[PDB]
Amino acid sequence: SVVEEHGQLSISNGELVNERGEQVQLKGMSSHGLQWYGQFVNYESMKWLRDDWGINVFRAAMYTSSGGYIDDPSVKEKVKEAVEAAIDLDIYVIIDWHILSDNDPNIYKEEAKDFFDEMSELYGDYPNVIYEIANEPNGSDVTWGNQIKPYAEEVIPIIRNNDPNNIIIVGTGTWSQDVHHAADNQLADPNVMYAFHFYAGTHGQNLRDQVDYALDQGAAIFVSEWGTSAATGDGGVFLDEAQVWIDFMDERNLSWANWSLTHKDESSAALMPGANPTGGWTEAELSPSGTFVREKIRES
Numbered sequence: 001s002v003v004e005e006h007g008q009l010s011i012s013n014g015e016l017v018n019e020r021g022e023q024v025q026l027k028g029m030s031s032h033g034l035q036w037y038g039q040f041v042n043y044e045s046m047k048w049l050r051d052d053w054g055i056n057v058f059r060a061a062m063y064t065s066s067g068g069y070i071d072d073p074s075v076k077e078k079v080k081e082a083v084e085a086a087i088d089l090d091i092y093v094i095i096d097w098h099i100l101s102d103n104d105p106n107i108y109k110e111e112a113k114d115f116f117d118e119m120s121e122l123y124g125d126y127p128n129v130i131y132e133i134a135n136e137p138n139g140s141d142v143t144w145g146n147q148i149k150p151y152a153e154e155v156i157p158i159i160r161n162n163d164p165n166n167i168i169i170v171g172t173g174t175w176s177q178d179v180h181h182a183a184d185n186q187l188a189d190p191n192v193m194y195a196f197h198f199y200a201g202t203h204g205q206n207l208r209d210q211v212d213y214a215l216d217q218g219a220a221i222f223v224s225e226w227g228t229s230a231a232t233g234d235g236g237v238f239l240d241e242a243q244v245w246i247d248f249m250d251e252r253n254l255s256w257a258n259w260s261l262t263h264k265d266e267s268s269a270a271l272m273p274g275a276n277p278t279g280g281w282t283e284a285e286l287s288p289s290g291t292f293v294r295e296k297i298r299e300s
């Protein structure tokens with residue numbers, strides 16, 4: 001239903017629109033690292049998220065380091081399973097080259113180009129696919145102008161050679177928070193979005209003003225990772241501030257993916273320890289975070 005109705009996505013005047021030009025907002029879940037919690041990413045769990053939660057996008061978080069793709073590349077196959085499931089369920093899917101401790105996207109750029117060549121050659125003629133080429137650039141020595149933009153200008157051409165206009169989400173500086181710098185020095189590709197990430201444990205009023213600054217420069221923004229917890233993914237659940245961000249994203253028509261779908265014992269995890277990896281969760285199998293996220297997407 002979703003992908004058949006909205007079809008080809010694109011960016012028009014800094015907004016995400018469907019193939020008939022109407023604004024569309026995607027809301028879904030991100031996996032946790034596929035090298036650790038890959039059992040939660042399968043057709044059945046994704047189908048349960050779609051039908052019971054109302055998700056319209058799923059994000060496959062393929063860590064590169066921390067036991068991820070560079071150490072064991074077999075995890076790319078789990079990305080393919082998520083993509084195929086999304087195609088079968090007629091929802092959108094984000095392929096995330098999940099950099100983090102490998103804080104500069106240039107560290108593994110050659111592997112990233114090869115990876116994105118393969119993914120775009122395989123799925124480049126489906127409208128479901130959204131490429132996220134560098135999850136969270138971070139560090140004082142990793143800037144938009146010197147490291148991130150140039151990386152993006154190497155990897156985007158590889159993708160575009162196989163897939164001319166599916167959406168590409170590009171990470172920003174300071175753990176994908178520095179949308180200001182990226183919005184003042186935008187990429188040429190017309191179907192790019194800049195990532196913006198937030199954690200409800202952080203007081204967010206200036207961060208909201210910064211997203212508004214970026215939007216005002218005509219940059220499109222995709223909230224490809226956010227949590228109800230602190231920045232570490234644990235440390236409490238902050239639903240009042242999470243609700244303020246939810247409302248802000250609805251007012252600005254910003255698409256988002258919540259972190260994360262796992263049973264790990266950390267506040268941002270959506271599931272409790274005994275949740276079935278294939279779905280069908282009862283209220284008791286959802287954590288306080290997962291209960292809130294599900295309500296937000298159902299309400300949508």
Ligand SMILES: *[C@H]1O[C@H](CO)[C@@H](O[C@@H]2O[C@H](CO)[C@@H](O)[C@H](O)[C@H]2O)[C@H](O)[C@H]1F
Nearest residue numbers: 066100135136225231232233259266268
């Ligand atoms: C965005 O922020 C989330 C929360 O910090 C990160 O997810 C955390 O990553 C650490 C390091 O891998 C894991 O130990 C935590 O369990 C996990 O919640 C995510 O990687 C980042 F993109």
